[model samples]
Target chain A: KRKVVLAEQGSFYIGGRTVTGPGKFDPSKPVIPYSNEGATFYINQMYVNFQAPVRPRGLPLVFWHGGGLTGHIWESTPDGRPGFQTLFVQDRHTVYTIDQPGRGRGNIPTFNGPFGQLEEESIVNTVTGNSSKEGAWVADRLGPAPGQFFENSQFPRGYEDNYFKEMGFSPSISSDEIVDAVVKLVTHIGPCVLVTHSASGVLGMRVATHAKNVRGIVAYEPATSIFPKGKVPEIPPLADKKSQIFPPFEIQESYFKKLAKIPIQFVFGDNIPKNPKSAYWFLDWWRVTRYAHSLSLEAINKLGGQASLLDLPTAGLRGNTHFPFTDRNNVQVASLLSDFLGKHGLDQN
Target chain B: KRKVVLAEQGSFYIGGRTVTGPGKFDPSKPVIPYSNEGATFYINQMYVNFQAPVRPRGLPLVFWHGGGLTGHIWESTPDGRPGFQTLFVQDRHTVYTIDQPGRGRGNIPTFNGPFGQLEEESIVNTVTGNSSKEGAWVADRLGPAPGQFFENSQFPRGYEDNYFKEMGFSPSISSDEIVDAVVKLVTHIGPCVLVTHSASGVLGMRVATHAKNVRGIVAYEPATSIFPKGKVPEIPPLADKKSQIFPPFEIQESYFKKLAKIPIQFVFGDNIPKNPKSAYWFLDWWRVTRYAHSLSLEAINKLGGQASLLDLPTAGLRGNTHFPFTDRNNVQVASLLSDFLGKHGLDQN
Candidate 1:
């Protein structure tokens, strides 16, 4: 009887906008927006293909890729096999993969202008545009560089920097931009699974904390700016050396504190730099930031938030470099991730 | 009384030479060959300077830096305020930071190549010139290459790969070279603590499994090649692209399983991979590898060997970049590492 109801509700329907309980739903909501009057941003759409549950209480799973890479990376075979597709399928859980901005199919909408280089433009384009009809009005204010007018209104000087800086980017892109994007994206879709790697880990944490639709977060090496601070030295030009270093930035412990309210899983490789070294201090900085993120979760729990840590066992990958997805051990890693999602309430079966 | 005795011992100790009831004793006897004459290695002559109980039981603590770095890398501050020296002092633990081959002072010898690029020559020189003359004689005939020699000589190679294949150099170095170097080094010292970061994590694991003198190992962001085997994709040469990709020639699972008999502590940063998308896969690999290593330890314990796992909650730099030492959060990461050492009985209180 439940199955019949679910079918009537179109729970199993694949593709093409399925809606239950008809109402005055607005389709004019732009997924991504641009500032110019005639400009339009290309929207690359893909589905999170999750299999039905074998068990009655199977959960849903979502997977997110890090920056500069596509969701296909997670699905690629490390050992030259067919990749993690079979592994996820066998796990009997629903899987979702997303291609974020500045990478993959999301790489559209050239923010070409004086303030265009700023990552904030991307954020505004993704968030306000995807969320509501007021997006056009917001775009009018955000589309042009400082002193450049859209609809006869001049944007303030350094508007891009000012807006993004307010959101967390001091002079460059910050994880908060992605966080906002994910928050907005989840609002359109119902509650489901969420997974993230590297920088997206920060986004995942944010969504887990702020979004009501997200069930859980499986953070595979979540990136943060919290761990290896105060060890890196400042050098000029920042380019000449084989080793890159980053200074310790102030971490907003409160952000992680809030994220701790969500269930999160963390993992990292052994071959990577685990501590702060001069040449590799940047790596250490990243680790420290992520560690801070985890700690924030703990702190949040202490402050009365729901959070859990996933203890994953180590798997052997022969000659595996940082890209375990392409390594033979990717299957094992994927299996473990899927299993964890299932164990949590995120995946089905 | 114990404090006085420890102070005297710590101050008076010189090298590995000591007097025993039977006769004049040299604790450095076993590792003399490898430390003194190996193709390329670092002999930490300043153990007393950083000697402290890592755990309550007073297990010795020894720390190692990542590739292209030195022991100083573990303690140096990013902001140049208080380095690892201040950290160790504050934490109340003895620390020994190793200068491994191809890094720090060790680079002076190994990179110079007077030690011979050939694996056999390196091992023969180390063993023949150092202590353990009988072992040296046996090691010499094991094989020109260290792997074959160890297999024939019945000396456990531990997880050291067949050196030639592992190094992937022109002439190929043998795993025996590393084994001989570590064995001689450990034998010279009494039971001691082992700490490693990044690439050295693998070396530390191998040494801990094979050397009786290694009481414990604290690995910070270790780089183990347990991911599945495959070739990285080739792309058009772009500046800085190599840094973006994973290195080829990682070790296999069989190797890690062989070294599961040693007590190990694995530390990782939440943001290991610079690229965020790869974070999930990276963490998956780490968790899986940790699990596998633990399993191997379990198997070893069943066989009457000691093995365990420690996950460091705070031992990484912030910012989620590839370089952690230069990250702002390194101070905390270093502190955490020192604290972990103290808790594990590997460093002095």
Candidate 2:
């Protein structure tokens, strides 16, 4: 049976630089020489692909990915489950998924800057909560400890290669360039609810401040967060009483007001350590950020902004790693998102 | 002013390989070693991006690209005019555009097979009809002579690099694989009208034969075509009385009936040579294929099929190039397509 009926599907680039004059040509070199003269080079354009259902019932969704990942994270889970992009569309919401500027299908040649990729070890330990493996680090931010499994973990197992296949090299580009390109999209398409994950969560906030058309934001386990100037949250000591490794980003009050005008929510996955500290900085970063996000939520509400935090475990869901939308219970995760939209009236047609 | 209102927007992949067993690991090599054991490899999937306007009035459209091109041809033109994908959506029609498997965003690793790309010289000479350039090959299938162009050629000039930017390497995959993947899309999305260009025209016909959900076809200057086995058209001599460079492709009558059941139209751009001749085989190829296509249309109608041909010049729309959808007069081209759909009643919801 045809489960989805779409009204439109296509892709386009949003921003780039035009280079003048043909550049040098080297046939012997592995890199293809650009016709540098009068050619667009170092194009840091974001590639956006969109699909609309026949009759959407909710506000459009602008899905932004975390660092080291492309729009693939929202398309399909490594284990072949329909990811949020499809799941939300199935729930009658239009979805726009983009390859962050300078990554994946979004063009940013290697010559422009250095590219980075997350190691498999880091992904398994931090992302999949698989620190139980032999070579895994000692940190247990996602579980009790290394070599100990969280009984209720929902991370899909038995598809490690599929998970690795989803990884790709990310270009070295500025957050400003990314924010500008994303703002351009929201401006072009009109009002849309933004869904940001991990690293993109902070950027999504910046985009909302810049783009007036951002109606709402759903941030999932944002790796970091910002506070209005003069109200930065105090850094807390680590679990071992060492100096805190994470610091809060501060933004202008004017920008904070812009973000405050919209409804915002930060959702966290399960298996995270309640204590926001550890000897390992990598493990400590997320927990500390989670604590920072809670304070930001409090500050937003004090400023008359509608902001809330959702810890999946508090909602009676467990076994989720850093990526809840791709976790085994993603359908339930999507339901929670729908409830948020409904509560805010963003689900109205 | 936002021009297009969408009820949905997103992208997905269809069709791929699941390789078993861990492949070899070579750290010294530039290629990333796959965890081949029980890992999938050699994925040959088509990337489909779509957008649907609110309250669509017409059947969905599946836009397929020509050789050496991706879905970008259906986006903004080289000169930045709205292409058919956006135009149709603006007119309240849903559209789905796809990068053919093994090309562009559609994934097919180089290790899977040989990939081919069109050279700049070939693009300018044959496709762009910029043969007036000093080093250009002497071929005027699109106009009167090597050093001259059709006075009304609508090819966008001064955007040579932008046009080149649209070109990408194509994987050397079989047409069977291409047809199968496209059919899977149509089947997954339910009924749709397929719009194909250049090399994809013939493949569109094959897709229609395999996919029962194809409601119609709009082929723009298809490079080649197929006829029912017993009704193969005889090859005609070239302009200089030389041997014809093209031979007719024959399909089974059963497949022909499947194609005939749908409303199909073959559209040709302006500036095409009428006599279908020349010492230049490149120029002769399209002319010969055009002649062959006429026979296919005739055969279709003879078998009680709804088939027609629209020569742009005959329709009072001139200055069109091989890529009419991206030419300066593309909006007008989109109007003609709408007219075709209206005539066939595919415009009805």
Among all candidates shown, the one with the greatest TM-score:
2
Worst 10 residues of 1 chain A by lDDT: A1-10
Report the number of clashing residue pairs per model: 122, 34
- Name the runs in model 2 displaced over 4 angstroms: A1-11, A14-97, A100-268, A272-321, A324-349, B7-10, B23-34, B50-58, B78-81, B90-92, B109-150, B153-163, B228-249, B275-285, B302-304
lDDT of 2 at A217: 97
lDDT of 1 by residue, A53-141 (tens): 33324544556765334444444331123334334544544444554543322322223232222223431221110101111112122
CA lDDT of B163 in candidate 1?
Answer: 12
In model 1 chain B, the worst 10-residue window by lDDT is B162-171
CAPRI verdict (incorrect, acceptable, medium, high) for model 1: incorrect
Candidate 2, B175-265: lDDT as tens digits: 7888888988998889899999877998999999888899999999887778888778786765656455445667899988887798999
After superposition, candidate 1 runs with Cα above 4 Å error = A1-57, A111-177, A225-258, A273-276, A279-294, A304-321, B1-349
